[PDB]
Ligand binder design. Structure first.
Ligand SMILES: Cc1ncc(COP(=O)(O)O)c(CN)c1O
Ligand SMILES: Cc1ncc(COP(=O)(O)O)c(CN)c1O
Lengths: 396, 396
């Protein structure tokens, strides 16, 4: 009985997946990508990293087990890059980070850490979200709530439905708040707004989650750990989950990490000690290839300088490309102020296609959306601009 | 509240850990290692793999997300090497394997796969075990039982306490039975013995777990997937968990995989589909560096031939070294037939040190055991033989 009467299906990420090249033709693109891509639409390897995969093929003297907390060089710049550089919060000794098989893999380690030590029973998320989010958050029974910004039409943040939809539950409760701007809505609380809700993370109670994948890829690097920081010399307890998978040409090989923080180097050596057990049951100690090629890039000024331009570029085209989609419709389409997209950050963003508009594209079209209205501006190109600009019209 | 009144400590694997080089001196060795090591006691990188880490530094064209089931070349030889080569069970289409962050990381994915689909509430293990075993098996509430061989004195398998301690519970129940010979007792049911209990996995009910790390490293490669197979054209349902981490100079970077098998390519496309969700919440898709450097070694006759001698050698010294410890005591010690060790396989094996004998070594000795009587014959050398042969006497 691993056999009969099961049940079965689909992460709404197959959502185009294969069915995309399926039928064979000018497939615009499954704008609904899990990734960046160039004015070529190749998800490259980078260099900076390649530049280091040599360095470790050169001196990788062994390959013995790794501690269940990876490596804190990976850890210290993780640290340094989150909280930021100078904070003696860093040398307050009051946050630790283990290595973790990136993104979604650090949030689940958060979940059983959190079933224990923590007397929590839930996490309120955000509507719309990341659909693996309510899933790696159901792990320790823990059910998710849906707080509520992005109320649409001016596709812009309902501070309102939020503080409100938010304020709503219990002290011992967990919110989840991703770094800058969003999946599926490269949206956001500005400074004063981040600023606004922390006075509220505070007395209300809460305690922040903080999914931070995409970090400084959707922002110049900097408004990013402000997003977070602002909510940091403000708190007392928090849990940040990160992932270098995107921002580094790193996935495949699971990279980022989970960081615990408290007021006491006593309280955090402690909570962390149990956390180091959440892990010990999953994978027992990290996918090491990753950490290394990230500690290295990160601890090399020559190498860190190759990487940082690579990232910078990578931004160029989501700041830049984002614009494009819009003038082209300013020159065809012509049914709305598609401005939003242009300045509404990240490589993700939803649109006015009541699904049905989008079941449509797939068609004797060959456009591939995410039946939520979400497109990876990342799959949008110089070459596609055009047709994809014209796919849509007839769709309205 | 991620802060006060927690709880906290120690996987009984720190058990020497650091405290070993601690005090500074002729440290014999923390015979209680998590790994192999040479007549040097360096846990090398190999070559064969190194030979391929070049091949992928050469053609690693991208590095996009990996499917949540890794790669089935990794998968097909995983397959082929488990069940074995020829079985059209293979082309019965009736077992699938996902990639997984090795060993302990495939057994936990087994656990939540198994909470679902499966209406199971427990796994009976083996006494003595692998202490992360009852831990990555408590995940989905699921508590572990302790079945019971290795009754001691002739340190050899109690078929008896077993079939018996075994037969004991319920149909819908899970046993766990590691591949050949053991941690901490490179022990074992011979062929007829493996042979014996399957007639019993069968009508009794059960359904095998099968932790298979160490595979063909403790045996010439071959009696190994016999261990398993014997129990294979015999069953109907099973769950095998593997790890190339040892046998390949691969850990650090989490490698092996979890394999589901059924009678129907219908039933197994199905159970697997849900299994592909256990995972989707943990790490979301595998530590890819691993699979690749293992599919490659495995699909290259030139390269597979470098690796297979590397493994062969690697055996040489557990067949060979195992002997050694014994004649040396045949020439000093002289208080028992320490034969057992010599032929009682793997790189692990327990001894007649009521702990206390071993709290002892640590001493104005500098020997480091595992306070269970377990020593990694793997840490035993030409050079150490000697002193370590003489550490013990005074211990008795
Ligand atoms: C909000 C969010 N969280 C977590 C992840 C996890 O991704 P990864 O594990 O590769 O970083 C993603 C992936 N894009 C994401 O969008
Ligand atoms: C019985 C057993 N099971 C699982 C593991 C997991 O190890 P790994 O994840 O590196 O293969 C080990 C490690 N030696 C083990 O001994």
């Amino acid at each position: 009985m691993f056999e009969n009467i099961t049940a079965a299906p689909a992460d709404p990420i197959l959502g185009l997946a294969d069915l995309f090249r399926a039928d064979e033709r000018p497939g615009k693109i499954n704008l609904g990508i899990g990734v960046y891509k160039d004015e070529t639409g190749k998800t490259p390897v980078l260099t900076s990293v390649k530049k280091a995969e040599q360095y470790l093929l050169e001196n990788e003297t062994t390959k013995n087990y790794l501690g269940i907390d990876g490596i804190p060089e990976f850890g210290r710049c993780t640290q340094e890059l989150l909280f930021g550089k100078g904070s003696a919060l860093i040398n307050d000794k009051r946050a630790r980070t283990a290595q973790t098989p990136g993104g979604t893999g650090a949030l689940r380690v958060a979940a059983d850490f959190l079933a224990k030590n923590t007397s929590v029973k839930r996490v309120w998320v955000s509507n719309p979200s990341w659909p693996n989010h309510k899933s790696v958050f159901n792990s320790a029974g823990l059910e998710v709530r849906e707080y509520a910004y992005y109320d649409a039409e001016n596709h812009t943040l309902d501070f309102d439905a939020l503080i409100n939809s938010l304020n709503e539950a219990q002290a011992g409760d967990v919110v989840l708040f991703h770094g800058c701007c969003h999946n599926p809505t490269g949206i956001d609380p500005t400074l004063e707004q981040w600023q606004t809700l922390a006075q509220l993370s505070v007395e209300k109670g809460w305690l922040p989650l903080f999914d931070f994948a995409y970090q400084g890829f959707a922002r110049g690097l900097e408004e990013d750990a402000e997003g977070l920081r602002a909510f940091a010399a403000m708190h007392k307890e928090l849990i940040v989950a990160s992932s270098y998978s995107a921002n580094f040409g790193l996935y495949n090989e699971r990279v980022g990490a989970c960081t615990l923080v408290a007021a006491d180097s006593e309280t955090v050596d402690r909570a962390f000690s149990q956390m180091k057990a959440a892990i010990r049951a999953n994978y027992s100690n990290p996918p090491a290839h990753g950490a290394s090629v990230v500690a290295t890039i990160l601890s090399n000024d020559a190498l860190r300088a190759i990487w940082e331009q690579e990232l910078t570029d990578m931004r160029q085209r989501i700041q830049r490309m984002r614009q494009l989609f819009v003038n082209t419709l300013q020159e065809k389409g012509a049914n709305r102020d598609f401005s939003f997209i242009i300045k509404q950050n990240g490589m993700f963003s939803f649109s006015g296609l009541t699904k049905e508009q989008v079941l449509r594209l797939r068609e004797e079209f060959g456009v591939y959306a995410v039946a939520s209205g979400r497109v990876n501006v990342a799959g949008m190109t110089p070459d596609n601009m055009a047709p994809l600009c014209e796919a849509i019209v007839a769709v309205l």
